[PDB]
Design a protein around this ligand. Sequence first.
Ligand SMILES: *[C@@H]1O[C@H](CO)[C@@H](O[C@@H]2O[C@H](CO)[C@@H](O[C@@H]3O[C@H](CO[C@H]4O[C@H](CO[C@H]5O[C@H](CO)[C@@H](O)[C@H](O)[C@@H]5O)[C@@H](O)[C@H](O[C@H]5O[C@H](CO)[C@@H](O)[C@H](O)[C@@H]5O)[C@@H]4O)[C@@H](O)[C@H](O[C@H]4O[C@H](CO)[C@@H](O)[C@H](O)[C@@H]4O)[C@@H]3O)[C@H](O)[C@H]2NC(C)=O)[C@H](O)[C@H]1NC(C)=O
Ligand SMILES: *[C@@H]1O[C@H](CO)[C@@H](O[C@@H]2O[C@H](CO)[C@@H](O)[C@H](O)[C@H]2NC(C)=O)[C@H](O)[C@H]1NC(C)=O
Ligand SMILES: CC(C)CCC[C@@H](C)[C@H]1CC[C@H]2[C@@H]3CC=C4C[C@@H](O)CC[C@]4(C)[C@H]3CC[C@]12C
Ligand SMILES: *[C@H]1O[C@H](CO)[C@@H](O)[C@H](O)[C@H]1NC(C)=O
Lengths: 219, 133, 203, 213, 290, 227
Amino acid sequence: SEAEGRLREKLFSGYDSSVRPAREVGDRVRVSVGLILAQLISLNEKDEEMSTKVYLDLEWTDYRLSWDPAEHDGIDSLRITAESVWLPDVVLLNNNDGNFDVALDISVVVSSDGSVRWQPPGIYRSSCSIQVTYFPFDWQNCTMVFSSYSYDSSEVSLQTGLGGHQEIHIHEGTFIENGQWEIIHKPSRLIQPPGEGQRQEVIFYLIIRRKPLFYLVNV
Amino acid sequence: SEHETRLVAKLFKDYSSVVRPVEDHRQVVEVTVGLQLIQLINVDEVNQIVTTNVRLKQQWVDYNLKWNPDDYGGVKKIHIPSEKIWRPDLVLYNNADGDFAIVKFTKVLLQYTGHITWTPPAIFKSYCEIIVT
Amino acid sequence: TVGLQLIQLINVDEVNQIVTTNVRLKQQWVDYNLKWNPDDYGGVKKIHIPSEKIWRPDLVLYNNADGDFAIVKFTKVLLQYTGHITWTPPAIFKSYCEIIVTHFPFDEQNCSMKLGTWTYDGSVVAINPESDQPDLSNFMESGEWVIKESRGWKHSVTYSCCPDTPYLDITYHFVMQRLPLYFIVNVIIPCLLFSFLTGLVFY
Amino acid sequence: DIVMTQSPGTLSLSPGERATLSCRASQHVTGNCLAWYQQKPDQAPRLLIYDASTRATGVPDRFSGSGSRTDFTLTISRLEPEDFAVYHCQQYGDSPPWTFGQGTKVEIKRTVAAPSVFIFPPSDEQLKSGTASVVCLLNNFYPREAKVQWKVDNALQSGNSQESVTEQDSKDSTYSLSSTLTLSKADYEKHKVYACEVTHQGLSSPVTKSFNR
Amino acid sequence: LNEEERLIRHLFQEKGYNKELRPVAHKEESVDVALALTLSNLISLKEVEETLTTNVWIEHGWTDNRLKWNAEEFGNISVLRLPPDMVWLPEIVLENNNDGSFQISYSCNVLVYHYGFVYWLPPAIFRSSCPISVTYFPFDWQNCSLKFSSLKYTAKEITLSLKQDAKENRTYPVEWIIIDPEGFTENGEWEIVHRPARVNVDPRAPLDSPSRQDITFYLIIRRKPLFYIINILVPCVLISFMVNLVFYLPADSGEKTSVAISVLLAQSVFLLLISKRLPATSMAIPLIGK
Amino acid sequence: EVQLVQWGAGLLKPSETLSLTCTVFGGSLRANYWSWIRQAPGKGLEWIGEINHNGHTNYNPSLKSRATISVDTSKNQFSLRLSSVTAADTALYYCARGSRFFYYGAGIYYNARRDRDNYFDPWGQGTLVTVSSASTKGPSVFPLAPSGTAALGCLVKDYFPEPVTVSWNSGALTSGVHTFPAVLQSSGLYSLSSVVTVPSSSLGTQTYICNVNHKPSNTKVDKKVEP
Ligand SMILES: *[C@@H]1O[C@H](CO)[C@@H](O[C@@H]2O[C@H](CO)[C@@H](O[C@@H]3O[C@H](CO[C@H]4O[C@H](CO[C@H]5O[C@H](CO)[C@@H](O)[C@H](O)[C@@H]5O)[C@@H](O)[C@H](O[C@H]5O[C@H](CO)[C@@H](O)[C@H](O)[C@@H]5O)[C@@H]4O)[C@@H](O)[C@H](O[C@H]4O[C@H](CO)[C@@H](O)[C@H](O)[C@@H]4O)[C@@H]3O)[C@H](O)[C@H]2NC(C)=O)[C@H](O)[C@H]1NC(C)=O
Ligand SMILES: *[C@@H]1O[C@H](CO)[C@@H](O[C@@H]2O[C@H](CO)[C@@H](O)[C@H](O)[C@H]2NC(C)=O)[C@H](O)[C@H]1NC(C)=O
Ligand SMILES: CC(C)CCC[C@@H](C)[C@H]1CC[C@H]2[C@@H]3CC=C4C[C@@H](O)CC[C@]4(C)[C@H]3CC[C@]12C
Ligand SMILES: *[C@H]1O[C@H](CO)[C@@H](O)[C@H](O)[C@H]1NC(C)=O
């Protein structure tokens, strides 16, 4: 860990985590955005909001955090507390409760070439306009819109995480299936701005069908 | 960005967020305020409280946060944390059971001319007289 | 020295068996390195210091149900020139209490709060009660319960493995009596009326 | 499970010189948990270094440990007469079983010296009991490497001799060696000439000592 | 405490302790972290929300060789109490929470012994997801889990294991949730039947993933159905059986269909009562619902 | 100052059970692990096994089936039993103090663990163990007759068990004496020679007698060696 300490001291001398990494003026930071659904907690029809537990998957490159492994005892990656590095201010725009941020900052994985991977957990309450016409035999289209809150498309460019399926990742073994909802489709899409202040978005869509057995028995 | 790192170091070397950001104390800080209503979350008639999702766009000029872009490789606009600078202390007078002021301190966009645009989000739980007639 | 002041009995939850109370947790101890001579400082005999700046006992409610385990309101301490420190933080204690519902709504409960230094044993930090009873001088009247009795006991446990290391706690127990008028009026009387109406069919 | 190999095997060095002993692990030694021990003749091993760099109590400053991972080194800056012993390495960082190296002996180096060779026929007293031992002595030589061959009527023997070697002398610091050829009395009488031939780097050519029975 | 002050200054100031680095000689080494769980009390299991609320104490044990000292040189000090924010920690969190509270509640002091062993017993109130099987309600049993892992460290950096008891001539791992017979008292509605603990390792997951390793503590709990029996099932069953009396009522009474439809209304009221107590799930019809 | 004192019978016959005991002075068995280590002649150190005061044992996989290590805390002793010994078990056996063992916690959290410092700083004096089917026997002593320095000596042949002592001229002659390490023959008996170099001019004038002693047979021989 002494070699790791030396590398950490070298990397963060003169490093400003509040400054976006752009080697030249006009350079854009590509941020790949993906999502893993750990649990579809609920879809509250009264409040019209979907509660989910997820892991984001954000990937970018920071040229300032590069090094030669041969000069640092063969160390080719690092785990660093997320607050110590620049982060893209990617938030859930369509949150319903007022919480924009991730549940826990945890750590980033920084490779020797400057690649940064961040997989923070998140408990999100997103607004979902309920289509009530065919309730309880209905299906819903609940979206999760992720975007930078501050940086515009000229500074931070977004792309769907893949490496390539444009979908929400669900682990077949560990996923907590909801007893009232079946996931039909789970795509993701990059939305360009119309036509600076213009901003791209990455929307993860959950098309879900209610399982109405309860209402068949009790009503 | 080495240029932006140097600029950010220079701007906050001798900066004070306490005093109003004017060259002369007899000047008035001009703040442009705009309210964007994103969502009408709830209208609780029993307790007479309206919950809304809003963005509170505030624009002003900080005299001391200026730079020549030619001295910093052509950097013309930056994003900085809002907690480091003087801000106007907007408060919702008729707050019922929410926050009086902004609590979500998002970044400000700062131009080289000193123009600041800060667009924080908020959940306004305001008090409304509900006529039930 | 540890003393408990019960300000209010906020609620008794018989379902989850939780008693929520508002308390002040008076703690007194001497700090050896925080002494001074007042004559050298203009006669200043006492000062007020943030509690986060000094060592404190790590008192924990051992029988916490679902609230806070330790003090979270770090109010200022009163420090005397002799090094004596008085710290009286407020807290809301949510403590487990085994609720016996046999005689409900005419039941009597015995709810306790066990307090101790979490990480220090009796050979490094010793706790003593301030008084034999909780301080009830500033207790707000409850519209649902009457506190019949209250008493604080210090306990010291030595395990056979470690005969030189006592583990200490102070347990404050409250024997409380429910006021049954609400259940008498709202529940018992209607049931009695239905029971009386049951027999009228036979006439 | 972890095999430890000490590389030098034998280190012939003069007093006042610098000694470097190597220990190699077949697997990563966790936490640099390596110990170095010294063992003099007719004595138990004595702990010299532990944790790969930390001197034990009463260990002079001349001994120093270094290295990591799978390569470890013990360095003696200035060699004294009391430092000529057998040195062992041991690993203790990866749960039992605890394993040692095979050991590395540090010998004293002196001017190359040739053996003086002597041959001894069996005594009449031994022949009376039915056996014959023929003894070849190589006296006061250095270095230790030497070869002895037995010839019986110019026919090379094999399998019927045993060697013994002394330690290095306390003063001259040299070695002596005996080779003993054992034959039945009946076989001994079947031949005339008994010879031992000795090769050593201090000899310009092999030396033979012989007798006629 | 001249000696404790001197020892802390020696360990942290003089030797330059860095809590951001793991306690290893080389980066490729992993830190052994032993975990055990003590169930102080099972607060509740909410069926509609499918959430288990527990009070647990998480016993952590690991080794930090940078925090080693020879006790005789420091007044025979053998153990130190230190704030957890001064030392490196293994960032163990509850993975399967459903409220966003991943971490322990009270960050108590660490006990650091002179041989480098770090002992840490933080308590926590956890709210975890527990999907509910309503098939035999109110005679149902549930299977809840508490999955502990690290998101800041992977299997490459820390190796999670269960507490190893070594007080006897044979060591063994503690493969159950610890329940103190003196400090524990059963939940009013749930009785613990089994309480195992397991180290789960995913063979397919990569070593550098946080999902490679976890330690899971399970609670098999049986509902105590006396409340539901007394207050729902006996009235409902008796009222339903009461409808058979109409066949013994003469047709001249003019009160048969009134009795029958009133029984139906009472059953409807009972269904209204029960609809508010269970989740609206589709795996099965509850026994009371059946 | 911890001291380890070993005892036990070093002379055993094939298929028997070696039994050794190590006693600790100046310290208790509670604080440490305690190990047995064997060193064969011309071979590296080999760890046999270890035990703590609770009786928890670890063994070398190559000796686990035959080695049993026990502890007795009342006498502050620990013992090794090696079953079915062969000639391959002839070695110098040591007892030594291993890693520190510590207790921590209280109540249900009371536990113990070992430190990661299993190096052997204190050692026992060592016990030589020889496994032979041979029987106590005394040597025959034969002259190695001298043929400007001469060599002469004595051949000390066919004895058991070690050791023999050899002196010259009742200890008055020490300069130039070499007494060789014994060799074990296939018969199972030991042989050695002792030699001395002397001026060839002294061969007529000076008497040379080798004094051989083998205590197990009370062999005492004074052999005059002459040309
Ligand atoms: C509602 O519920 C609460 C419980 O939550 C209940 O509270 C109990 O109240 C009773 C009183 O009615 C308490 O009983 C008393 O406890 C006193 C304190 O006991 C502790 O301290 C003792 C003193 O320790 C010091 O001195 C001893 C030598 O004397 C020394 O060895 C120690 O090291 C130390 O210096 C200690 O001896 C005692 O230990 C006993 O108990 C423990 C626990 O059972 C046991 O493990 C030990 O082996 C030993 O037996 C303990 O640590 C105590 O002083 C007091 O004694 C008086 O009464 C007894 C009556 O038998 C006389 O014999 C004695 O001479 C004294 O006159 C008495 O025992 C009880 O402890 C409370 N429980 C708790 C947990 O707080 C309420 O009563 C309930 N209310 C209702 C139902 O109305
Ligand atoms: C370790 O201790 C256990 C418990 O004493 C030993 O197991 C017992 O051994 C005796 C032999 O005399 C049996 O009679 C018992 O039935 C065993 N079990 C119990 C529960 O006592 C075990 O043999 C010990 N191990 C060693 C190698 O000494
Ligand atoms: C007509 C009478 C019997 C009233 C109707 C009783 C009905 C509701 C039945 C259905 C399931 C039954 C319960 C199932 C299991 C047991 C066994 C034992 O633990 C005591 C009784 C108890 C708890 C039963 C009590 C009666 C019970 C609740
Ligand atoms: C530690 O050091 C002190 C002072 O030398 C000594 O009195 C004491 O016996 C030692 N051991 C213990 C366990 O206190």
